[PDB]
Design a protein around this nucleic acid. Structure first.
Length: 983
RNA sequence: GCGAGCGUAGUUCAAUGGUAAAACAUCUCCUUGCCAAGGAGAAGAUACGGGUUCGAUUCCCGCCGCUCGCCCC
């Protein structure tokens, strides 16, 4: 038969009542979610056992949609299970319950996808997954780590069943009202009374006069009750205080600045209320309980650390951190290995080392004792150092010999190495090599050991005997588990040599790169059935590979009516949420009504497709509804209602930013030198620039921001010279993306970057090396890339002042210099990325930092010129005079003259300087620089050898100093010769 | 508050249970006199305290200050 709603509860309660949980009633006050119940938030704190499963309604006014959208409701029923402490069968009891509910496990793709839950409202976080069943997200699984502010001890396991969608996906209905509550009655005919009127109340009839005066009253009452050591009512009032904030948010009378205040007040109250329950319960003595705590031949060596599911971006790191650090320890312990190779899978990190000997290399080593002079006197017995050395290393005195090195030659002795049996070494060393792995995030399950996910078994084998060592309370043995619910639930490996053959007997494709050649070899074969090809982005396949133990591709179909949507919406929906493979025809290369998904294991073919297409054709209904509602009005009207998006608390929303950009675009369009004839269209592009951010299709599809504006503009009936400008206001979006290539778009891009930098530097928000409050480095790197990779002249210090003029607040002259220095420092980092020597760019950029393109075309050429074998000659000559200038500055008062000039050497040098100064101007490049400076070198030697520039007469000294300074000042405007390596 | 990483000439850097190395800068001098260019020498140091050992820049502990997460925000 078909499962009904009122007996799924009866099957989910009588099951958890047999494991040992104590079922209780629902909440009392309107809870905004399934966690804020006092039976879970206040009871996980403190060392007492707690096993509870219950069912509760959840009310969220923010998700009210008049009860028409088949996905979002204002009242959904959840099932909560809390286990503490975790008994080790955490994710096996869940599968047993799922089987007992009525659905089979052997014919449904049940997989875990990593998802980290975190809620700043009450201060909690943890690590866990969401359970996918044929593409439906039906269950949340989470190991807690922290509640309020206390650290959990011991950690707890939370299993949340979203019960309204399980039956909606199991029965086969498409709407939500079509769910049947019982045999005879339905869900949509008795639970819409508390839906429609509640939606109407939460949307446009909730009187806001009383809510904003009940919120503070409840906060004050909660504080007063908490001050009297009354925990339960104090926390009870917090729930009805936090409900008022949500109902205020639903109406829309909360600004973007009071949100932080409300969140801070609520979290402070929750933090100061949570740490009172622990202090209250400790005085009662914890009535519930308390928690505590002969030579052979080289044979193979296998190490496997069987854990639970790991994120797709941690297997790659761990399988390298293990093998790289393991191929080093055996070298430290003078072991002899063969071919070492590591394998990774979402449930294990194996390393196989072949031909590992059973013994160590017993060889003698020569030590290095004290100096011979110190340890041996001129006459008599050797001093105390020699005897100390002998008694330390247990060697005879005659064994000492003298070898000549350094000043004091040496004292040397020969000692053994104490060869062990090559098994005790591994026994004593493995607990360090295993624990040496580190991850960006970690957790604990039953001890104080840090790891990405819980470890469930360890299989460390060498030849025929087992290496005995215990890690995290697990003893290493000779058993390994394969596919769950399969016939080979757990198998025994008799010898480490016959290991990789056993796993492929269980169907597991352990090799990391082998799975790619079986995914992409079948996905292409399945395409030719309809005459097409797949789309395989690297960032998609790299993550699809590390989610499957034994891949199996299946194709599926959907209706053609969804082809009217934009091409970049279907691809985004397919590839960013469900991780499918789109299909494109070879001829007329648009989208096709097909998709390819990857199952996991041995599953029924028909059921997975029939249950997966019903999700793919359920997402597109929402997408099409949003698109149709979003194309009712043209793009012009959306520019007014963007004020709900804040830019900065001190600067404001996006409307002010757009007005500033459209005001200051004219000057920037003139600094870049773009012709006047194109100035009108630019002034119109900013009229609609960055207006897609308030649209409906972009509210939830963040990645589509920037292109949907172009699509709307094209549909509106505007010229093609403005849609490209609208689209290219966000490029580049990520590293490696394309750059703007149309002239009107460059102006908008650089104007936006400059305004965003100036505004955020006006409030003083300089990021550090680690934190990125706004990613200003990314913006600067985009700006310099746009300026350089497009060959456009610019003046940074002149444009920045103009940009800062229209800022709402006055900004001092130090911020512009700080921004210029920051951009210069980023330009240096960019220029040292293509192999340019650091000392060359470091010298060019201290003088050519104004126009980035000029600097990029000068520093890429001066390095190439520096290999002419004459570069050091010019470097030595030009600034040989410079080191004389520093010191006395009396000669700077006057300049040269032809009255007190001395013998013809200085006159010839001055004539040569006058000749060469004509070709050197600040607007010259370096092509003719050295070719013109070569003629000045010859008189310089004669001058410095035959003028005696020593200051004997004040007038001649001043004149000579001035002449020398003006000779040495020529490169002022081209490059500097201080950071020069030749110097 | 709570973890890690650290600390050697003025700067940059070598090594290991044992008489502390090298560049650069400074200085003293030899070339025809002042800078460049060839040579010789000089001085220059283990953040600080204790413990054990014949003997620790090295092993253990205390403190000083720096840098990074977390706390706060």
């Amino acid at each position: 038969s078909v499962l009904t709603f009122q007996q799924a509860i009866q099957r989910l309660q009588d099951y958890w009542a047999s494991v040992g949980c104590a079922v209780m009633q629902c909440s009392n006050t309107e809870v905004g979610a399934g966690t804020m119940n006092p039976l879970t938030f206040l009871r996980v704190l403190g060392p007492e056992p707690w096993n509870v499963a219950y069912v509760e309604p959840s009310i969220r006014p923010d998700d009210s949609r008049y009860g028409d959208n088949p996905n979002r409701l204002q009242r959904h029923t959840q099932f909560q299970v809390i286990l503490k402490p975790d008994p080790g069968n955490s994710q096996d009891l869940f599968l047993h319950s799922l089987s007992a509910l009525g659905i089979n496990v052997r014919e449904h793709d049940i997989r875990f996808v990593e998802d980290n839950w975190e809620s700043p409202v009450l201060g909690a976080w943890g690590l866990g997954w969401e359970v996918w069943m044929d593409g439906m997200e039906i269950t949340q699984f989470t190991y807690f780590q922290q509640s309020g502010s206390l650290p959990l001890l011991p950690v707890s396991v939370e299993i949340t069943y979203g019960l309204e969608r399980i039956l909606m996906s199991l029965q086969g209905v498409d709407h939500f009202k079509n769910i049947q509550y019982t045999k005879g009655i339905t869900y949509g005919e008795l639970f819409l009374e508390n839906e429609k009127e509640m939606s109407a109340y939460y949307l446009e009839h909730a009187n806001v006069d009383n809510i904003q005066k009940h919120f503070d009253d409840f906060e004050e009452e909660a504080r007063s009750l908490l001050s009297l050591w009354l925990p339960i009512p104090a926390y009870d009032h917090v729930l009805k205080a936090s409900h008022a904030f949500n109902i205020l948010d639903s109406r829309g009378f909360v600004g973007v600045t009071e949100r932080a205040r409300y969140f801070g007040r609520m979290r402070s109250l929750a933090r100061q209320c949570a740490q009172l329950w622990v202090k209250t319960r400790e005085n009662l003595g914890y009535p519930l309980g308390t928690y505590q705590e002969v030579v052979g031949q080289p044979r193979a060596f296998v190490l496997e650390i069987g854990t639970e599911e790991l994120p797709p971006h941690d297997v790659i790191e761990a399988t390298k951190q293990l093998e790289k650090s393991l191929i080093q320890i055996l070298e430290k312990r003078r072991l002899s290995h063969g071919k070492v190779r590591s394998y990774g899978t979402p449930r294990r990190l194996a390393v196989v080392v072949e031909n590992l000997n059973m013994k160590q290399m017993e060889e003698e080593i020569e030590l290095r004792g004290p100096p011979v002079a110190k340890a041996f006197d001129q006459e008599g017995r050797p001093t105390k150092a020699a005897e100390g050395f002998c008694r330390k290393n247990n060697v005879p005195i005659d064994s000492l010999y003298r070898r000549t090195d350094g000043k004091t030659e040496y004292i040397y002795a020969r000692v053994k190495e104490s060869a062990r049996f090559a098994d005790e070494v591994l026994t004593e060393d493995l607990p360090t090599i295993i624990s040496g792995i580190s991850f960006p995030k970690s957790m604990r399950w039953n001890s104080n050991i840090v790891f990405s996910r819980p470890i469930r078994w360890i299989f460390a084998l060498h030849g025929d005997l087992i290496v005995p060592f215990c890690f995290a309370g697990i003893s290493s043995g000779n058993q390994s588990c394969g596919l769950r619910n399969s016939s080979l639930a757990n198998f025994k490996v008799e010898a480490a040599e016959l290991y990789l053959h056993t796993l492929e007997k269980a169907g597991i494709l352990i090799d990391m790169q082998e799975r790619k050649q079986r995914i992409l070899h079948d996905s292409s074969i399945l395409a030719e059935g309809v005459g097409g090809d797949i789309i395989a982005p690297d960032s998609l396949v790299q993550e699809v590979i590390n989610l499957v133990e034994a891949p199996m591709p299946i194709i599926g179909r959907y209706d053609v009516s969804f082809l009217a949507l934009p091409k970049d919406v279907l691809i985004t929906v397919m590839q960013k949420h469900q991780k499918y493979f789109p299909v494109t025809s070879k001829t007329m290369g648009n989208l096709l009504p097909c998709f390819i998904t990857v199952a996991n294991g041995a599953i029924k073919e028909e059921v997975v497709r029939k249950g997966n297409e019903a999700v793919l054709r359920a997402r597109y209904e929402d997408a099409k509804f949003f698109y149709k509602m979003d194309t009712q009005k043209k793009l012009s009207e959306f520019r007014d209602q963007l004020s709900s998006i804040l830019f900065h608390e001190r600067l404001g929303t996006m409307l002010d930013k757009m007005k500033r950009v459209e005001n200051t675009v004219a000057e920037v369009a003139l600094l870049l030198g773009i012709n006047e004839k194109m100035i009108p269209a630019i002034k119109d592009a900013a009229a609609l620039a960055m207006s897609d951010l308030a649209t409906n299709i972009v509210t939830e599809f963040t990645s589509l921001a920037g292109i949907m504006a172009r699509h709307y503009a094209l549909r509106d009936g505007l010229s093609e010279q403005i849609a490209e400008a609208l689209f290219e206001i966000t490029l580049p979006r990520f590293s490696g993306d394309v750059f703007p290539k149309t002239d009107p778009g460059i102006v908008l891009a650089v104007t936006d970057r400059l305004d965003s930098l100036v505004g955020l530097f006006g409030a003083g928000c300089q990021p550090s090396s680690t934190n990125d409050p706004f990613g200003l480095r990314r913006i600067s790197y985009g700006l310099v890339q746009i300026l350089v990779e497009n060959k456009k002249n610019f003046d940074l210090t002149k444009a920045l002042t103009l940009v800062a003029e229209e800022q709402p607040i006055t900004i001092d002259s130090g911020v512009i210099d700080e921004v210029v220095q920051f951009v210069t420092r980023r330009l240096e980092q960019l220029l040292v990325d293509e192999g340019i020597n650091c000392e060359i760019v470091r010298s060019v950029l201290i003088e050519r930092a104004n126009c980035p393109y000029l600097a990029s075309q000068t520093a890429i050429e001066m390095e190439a010129f520096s290999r002419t074998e004459d570069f050091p000659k010019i470097v030595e000559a030009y600034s040989r005079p410079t080191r004389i200038i520093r010191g006395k500055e009396i000669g700077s008062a006057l300049e040269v003259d032809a009255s007190v000039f001395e013998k013809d050497e200085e006159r010839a040098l001055w004539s040569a300087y006058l000749e060469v100064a004509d070709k050197i101007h600040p607007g010259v490049d370096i092509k003719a620089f050295a070719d013109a400076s070569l003629e000045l070198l010859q008189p310089l030697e004669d001058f410095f050898t035959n003028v005696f520039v020593m200051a004997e007469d004040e007038k001649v000294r001043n004149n000579r100093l001035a002449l020398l300074t003006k000779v040495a000042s020529l490169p002022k405007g081209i490059a500097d010769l201080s950071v020069l390596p030749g110097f």
